[PDB]
Subunit: 69 residues, 11 copies
């Protein structure tokens, strides 16, 4: 299965997994502090991932950056 790479560019970045299935809700929020890297797959339990906070993200489609408020 595909995965996403998230590098936090500020403290308190949240990487949130959304449930697979007929229902959609957040099942887990991993907090990353500045400079930490998370490499996360899609899985039986996770079919969408939301990133909140300033982060550098890599997927198979290229680079994208999230920006916080």
């Amino acid at each position: 299965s595909d995965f996403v790479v998230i590098k936090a560019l500020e403290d308190g970045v949240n990487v949130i997994g959304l449930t697979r299935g007929a229902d959609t809700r957040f099942h887990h929020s991993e907090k990353l502090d500045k400079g930490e890297v998370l490499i996360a797959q899609f899985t039986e339990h996770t079919s969408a991932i939301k990133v909140r906070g300033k982060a550098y993200i890599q997927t198979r489609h290229g680079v994208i950056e999230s920006e916080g408020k």
Copy 2:
């Protein structure tokens, strides 16, 4: 399964999942505020995705932007 990357370029962007099967309707709308990123797969329950609002979108076919 494939996925789409959606970065909101303004507040209040909606990423809407349409149901897989003989019946087509919206089943979830995820609200993204400015700068938030959602990476969302097609799934057993979602066979089309609609993006409403200003966003930068990446798919296997390249970049497209909603307005």
Copy 3:
């Protein structure tokens, strides 16, 4: 399964799903307002997609544009 990307270039673009199987008819019409994007798969129920109205379309074969009546 493959998917198509449709970005509406005017209001009232109509993305039409045609039934898979021995019979052929439309089963769903999804209307897009200008600037909305729909990313839609081929599925168990949909084996052909028709686009009516001005739109920018991406598929695995490249870019094509529909033009309205």
Copy 4:
């Protein structure tokens, strides 16, 4: 399955599906008007597709154009 993209360049374009199996006959003709785009797969029921009238066609092998009589 593979799919074809067909964009009508004049009114009255016919995209014709031919039956899969031991017998070969037309089972459906989708009429497209000028500027409409149809993205159609090969399927359990459709093993060959015929295009009549002026159209721009994309497949995995590239672009080809049909011309009307």
Copy 5:
């Protein structure tokens, strides 16, 4: 499965399907008039395709032209 694209460059082009199996014969001939395009797969029933008449053909291996 693979497919072939055939564009007829004159009237009366024939695209002929040969049967899959221990027996080999033509089972269908599709007539194309000038400008018409046929996109045809290999299938449970068709394991070879013959093109007769002037046509522009694309396959995965590139382009080829038949001549009447």
Copy 6:
């Protein structure tokens, strides 16, 4: 979804010969092509080798090759 070969006859009477798959090897079918005709033929349950006799332009996944007649 097996591989296939494209054969364009460059003279009349090109002979495309299918050989039997299996412990035994002989031809089971010969398809003659007139000049300018194109045959697109797969390997299959029954054909595991294809021989071309006569002048022809041939394409496969490995590129172009040309047969030359007797």
Copy 7:
């Protein structure tokens, strides 16, 4: 399955595996000292990997660096 390469650029880099399943928690943390390389797969037990500390990382999507 895919894998990640992590080279520690300082002492005490932590490579942490998060559990696959309905629940998400850390199940192992491997400590790397400066200059050690760990090549780690995603697995039945590990569906997310976190890197804490200064490291050079390669995945299929390219190079990224974590910072202490």
Copy 8:
């Protein structure tokens, strides 16, 4: 399965099929006259192919030429 293309560059080229399995012997020799092309797969019965005589050969790995005896 993979296949080889062999074009005979002189009369009497032999394309020899070696048996798959614990024993190894020649089960068939196909004689090619000058200019003939043989396109032959590896199969249930053939796991190695020997070419004797002058020939131009294409495989997935590129071109190679056999030389006369």
Copy 9:
């Protein structure tokens, strides 16, 4: 099949350490390479992560990386 890594020892005493697949994570084998030896090692039913300790040149599908000793 599974991916593999190539390791070339650039000094004596390089250790290539296999970590167990499964719920438990521990070292199960450590192969010691002397200078100039090469090891080409798969991921397997029993090994889901590999650690290299000591100066070595390493190739994987993602490219070259070099480990360094203390």
Copy 10:
């Protein structure tokens, strides 16, 4: 399965098949004379191939030459 192409560059080149399985031994040696080409798969019976003598060899990893 993958295959290798071997062209003999001198008489008496041997292409040797090593048995697949718990035991490793030579089960067949194919003698190639100068200019002959052998194209040989890995199989149920053969999991390694040794070339002895002067030969030009092609595999998916490119060209290599053995030397007498």
Copy 11:
């Protein structure tokens, strides 16, 4: 299944197969004299290969050379 190519650059090169499974030991050592080439797969019995002595080695990841003591 992947394979490696090993060409001996000196006499007495050893290509060693290490057992697959919970236990790890040498099950076979193939000696190569100068100029011999061995092309060897990973297999049910062999999950790691060690090369000792001066050799030129090709894998999917490119070229590497072992050096003798």
